Structures are given as C-alpha cells and as structure tokens.
Amino acid sequence: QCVNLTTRTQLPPAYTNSFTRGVYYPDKVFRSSVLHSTQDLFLPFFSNVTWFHAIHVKRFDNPVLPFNDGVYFASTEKSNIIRGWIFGTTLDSKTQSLLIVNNATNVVIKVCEFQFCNDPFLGVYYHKNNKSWMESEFRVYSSANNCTFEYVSQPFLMDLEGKQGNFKNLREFVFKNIDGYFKIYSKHTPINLVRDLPQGFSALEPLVDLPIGINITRFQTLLALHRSYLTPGDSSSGWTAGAAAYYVGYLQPRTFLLKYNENGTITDAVDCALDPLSETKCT
C-alpha cells in the first residue's frame, strides 16, 4: 500500500543550540518558594541539538534516529504537520514496536508487531470545488499481529487546513523508557518566531506512563504531506510538502538546581557542573 518518495533533494544536516530548555517536574510533590536539588536525566544546558525541517522551496526529513536513554523532541508548526512517532528495535516484524498516531480523528497508541515499510507518512488532499481539506492517505504499516496494547481516544476534528505566514505553535515532549515504563512529558506554547527555538524557560508537566515493556533503541517521526491538483504526479512525484520544523536532543544523567516560586511553578534552573560558576552556585 505505502509507496516510495523520489523527489527529495538532500542537504548536509543542520544543528542549533538548546537555550536553557528541557526542564520537567521530577516528582508529583507540591513545593513553593524552595531551592531544590535533583539528580536525574536532563537535557544539558546549551546543547548542540539537531534540526530537521519540511519545506517545499524540496526537503522532507523523517530518518531513523537512535534512542539513547531518552529523547527531547521539540516541534514548531502552524498547520499540524508533525503528527506521529514510531519506536522500536528493528521495525521488521520480528520485534514488538510502539506506534503513536494522531490521524485527525483519534489518538491511537499501539504496542504491536508491525511491518513498517521504508517511507511511512500520512496524506491530506485539497478539493478545489469547495473549501475543505481532508486527510485521506494512511500508509504507515502493512500488517500487525500479536497485538498487545490498545488505546483509542474520543473522536474529534482537527484544523488541518493549509495555513501560511509565521510559525505559531511550539510543542515539546520528553520520552524516557525505564523499567518497562514509557514515560512521556508534554508542553505546549504559543510563539511568533519564524526560524528557530525561542529563548526562554518552560517546565514540562507529566503526561502519560505506558506499561509497555519494550526494548527501544530507535525511533522515527510521522509527518503529513499535501496532495493537490497542481502537481499531476501519481503517487511519488505528485506530493507537495508543508512547512514545519522539529529539533531533536538526547538526555544525560545530570544534577539540576530548580527554583520553586511562591505559587509553586518552576521558574529557573541551574545545570550543575556545566561550568565552574554553576558549580559555585550549586555549593
């Protein structure tokens, strides 16, 4: 069912900086006006993160990336393009794989023995006669057996109409797989920048803890393209990309000094043993 895309033009990879970004709540305990020291897996301050983007100019990036003790994944978008993740070891129907997809109607999370093909994606079609954008193509996998987990959310409709201008929505996620538990922290922010990650601070709140029990070493991102009457290609040349970006970083065990204000929200943090001044601040 799924096909192969033969239109992308490749460029050397791009890297950016993580400006004091990627701090999440370590526990579910309320603290107010406290300087609290913690020892956990965090994204180091001023890290050299990787940048991927989907534009038409064409660039359409969704490679297989490693999974080293956890992943910090940020996404800047305006048309809800980035809409899925796939985690697994081999992705070749020999080991179990985890799939999280938002297909504009439901949020499906499945731990299942999938047969993923080379280029998984989703596809939206635009109708000229009346103004209605609808999702029509779902080409992630081909078969699924021994299918353990199951979760389907309530139905809904998502604004997937093509919008241009300036990037609006920034969504940050932290995934970590420990002791059979897949823990996901999430956060959403409205922004008005055009190119890169805004400089600022934002704490990530716990979102979900899935008891999956999977050996996870690799992961991949599921984007959505657009099909229009402008390009008369059949399946591999008639695809036009949207405009979105996502940044990837890896977590490491570190010591952090967090500041809880009077209301009980994290406002500042010190990545300890970053530079000797930070160590002095720790002491």
Partner: protein, 325 residues
C-alpha cells in the same frame, strides 16, 4: 537533675506540648469490589514467556473473602508490612499473572538467577509490592501430558526488569548461521512444559500473581476497607489521609495544587499541605506543640512554691498549665 533536691535558680523544661483530642479518617468513597475472581479464579492463564499484565483501579481492597478458599502456598511482600495492608491506599496496582514449575517459584524474587529470572521474567532491584503463588495441579495438569504452557530456554543476553520477549527466532549456538532452520547448533528457543498428575512435588504447575504498586506519593484510587469519618478543623487531632497518619491541626489553605498533585512538603521534607480525597480542597497541617517553659524556684529545703514563665505568649484561657493568680 536526677535528684530529689533542687537548688535555687531558674531551669528550662520541655516546650508546651499539647495532646490530641480525637482521630479522623479520610478515604475516597468507592463502593465497588474489584475482581478477586478474574485474577485468582480465572479459567485460563498465560505462559511465562508472555505473562499477562492487568491494571486494577477503583477498589476496596479487602482480601478477607480469599479466606473461604484459595489457600496460598507462597505470599511474600516487599516494601510494606502485611499487617498494614488495611490502613493504606495504593496508587496504581498492576497484576502480572503466569504459570511456572514449582521448583522455579524461588526465582520470583529480586536479585535471583536461573532461566526464569534471566530469559523469561525479571523483577527490579527496588521492588514495592509482592508475590503470591499457589499450586494448581488439579486444573493445569491432565493425564497424557499438557503442552499448552511454553517457556524460553535460549537467549543472547539477560532481560531488563519488567520486559517481555515473545519473538520466536532460531538461536545460533555455534558459529555457522542458521537462516531460519532447525539443525546442528541451531535450536528453537521456546519449548513446552510437561505436566502430568503423577509427577513429583517439584514438577507440578504453580500459578503466580505479582502485584506492583506505589505508596504515599501520588493520588490513590485503590484503597483499603477502612471506613470514613467527619472532618474537624482548628483542633489538634490524629489524621489518616490516604494512609498518611499524623497528628496536627488542619486549617483552610490558599495554595492551588495542580490536578496531578496530592501532598505538599516543607523545606525540612515534611508534610505541610494535603488535599481532602472526599471533597477537593487544600488544608494545611500545623503542629500543636509550641512555646518554651521555664521554672523559677528557691531551694527545695526552703519551700515548695515555684513560678512558671511561659515564653512567647501574652496574658493581657491561654496556653498555660494552670492560670492560678
């Protein structure tokens, strides 16, 4: 002073320590009894290489109905005392059920070795919860053999805690590749148990259920069979909030907790604020012991009259032993 005689002067005694009045219990109000018959009284259990995991919620954990039948040969609990199971509330209880051989029941424990503990099922080193195991020779075993239960024998490396491996690929023991065929130095990983009613004690099927949970850190749904009590305030009382027991005064609060927070802690890492499970409101907990006390006395060979000085308090009743004059 460890003596019957006291010299003239002033001495410092213990602070004004006040005793509690009554005791209260506040548990979330749940009426359902979660299934003890779909976990312990089921008709079909999964194999050990693919063990069954079930989440349980909205409980009244009584376990007093398990006395009429289902005598358990093994019941070992880590992280909590067995006698305190009726005074606690549990956050998220997971039941892991499977069937093994009796001689292997000793391998279901933290920090153990063997084929079960290495290739099939592994428990974490920091384990909270506990293990139950009982003999089921008259249910899982039949004459002529019962090969419906399988287990893994060959694996490249040991498993991680709470990890499941159900893949069935040919295992290479020597150096030549196998390429999906069974031959010389190319074995099949899974093999079936052999269960018969005439086997020995060791070679008999044992059903094992492992319960995993967390205590006193997050909002709890599974709770014990204790009753509830009315809420009192502005008095030093003994409280039991979701298993957290203490003494203090409960006062109306102004903090607003996030929807996933239940307890608040001080800089000294002690409980300060708590959310009432019955009605969602925040209350602050304050100790009811406060204020120093000093005694002024002449020599005991002169008189027995003394004076008492209570620090940090006006007198213009109050927190005094006896007002007097």
């Amino acid at each position: 002073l460890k003596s019957f005689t006291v010299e003239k002067g002033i001495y410092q005694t213990s602070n004004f320590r006040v005793q509690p009045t009554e005791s209260i219990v506040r548990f979330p109000n749940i009426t359902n009894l979660c299934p003890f018959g779909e976990v312990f009284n089921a008709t079909r259990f999964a194999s050990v290489y693919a063990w069954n995991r079930k989440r349980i919620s909205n409980c009244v954990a009584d376990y007093s109905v398990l006395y009429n039948s289902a005598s358990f040969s093994t019941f070992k609990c880590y992280g909590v005392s067995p006698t305190k199971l009726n005074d606690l509330c549990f956050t998220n209880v997971y039941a892991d059920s499977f069937v093994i051989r009796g001689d292997e029941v000793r391998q279901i424990a933290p920090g153990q070795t063997g084929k079960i503990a290495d290739y099939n099922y592994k428990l974490p080193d920091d384990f909270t919860g506990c293990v139950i195991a009982w003999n089921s020779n008259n249910l899982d075993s039949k004459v002529g053999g019962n090969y419906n239960y399988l287990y893994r024998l060959f694996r490249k490396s040991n498993l991680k805690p709470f990890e499941r491996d159900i893949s069935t690929e040919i295992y290479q023991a020597g150096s030549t590749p196998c390429n999906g065929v069974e031959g010389f130095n190319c074995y099949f990983p899974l093999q079936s148990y052999g269960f018969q009613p005439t086997n020995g004690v060791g070679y008999q099927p044992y059903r094992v259920v492992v319960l995993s949970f967390e205590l006193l850190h997050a909002p709890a749904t599974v709770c014990g069979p204790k009753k509830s009590t009315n809420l009192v305030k502005n008095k030093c009382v003994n409280f039991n909030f979701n298993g957290l027991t203490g003494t203090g005064v409960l006062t109306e609060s102004n903090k607003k907790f996030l929807p996933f927070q239940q307890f608040g802690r001080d800089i000294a890492d002690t409980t300060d604020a708590v959310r009432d499970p019955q009605t969602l409101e925040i209350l602050d907990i304050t100790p009811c012991s406060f204020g120093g006390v000093s005694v002024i006395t002449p020599g005991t060979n002169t008189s027995n009259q003394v004076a008492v000085l209570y620090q940090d308090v006006n007198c213009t009743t109050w927190r005094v032993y006896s007002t007097g004059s």
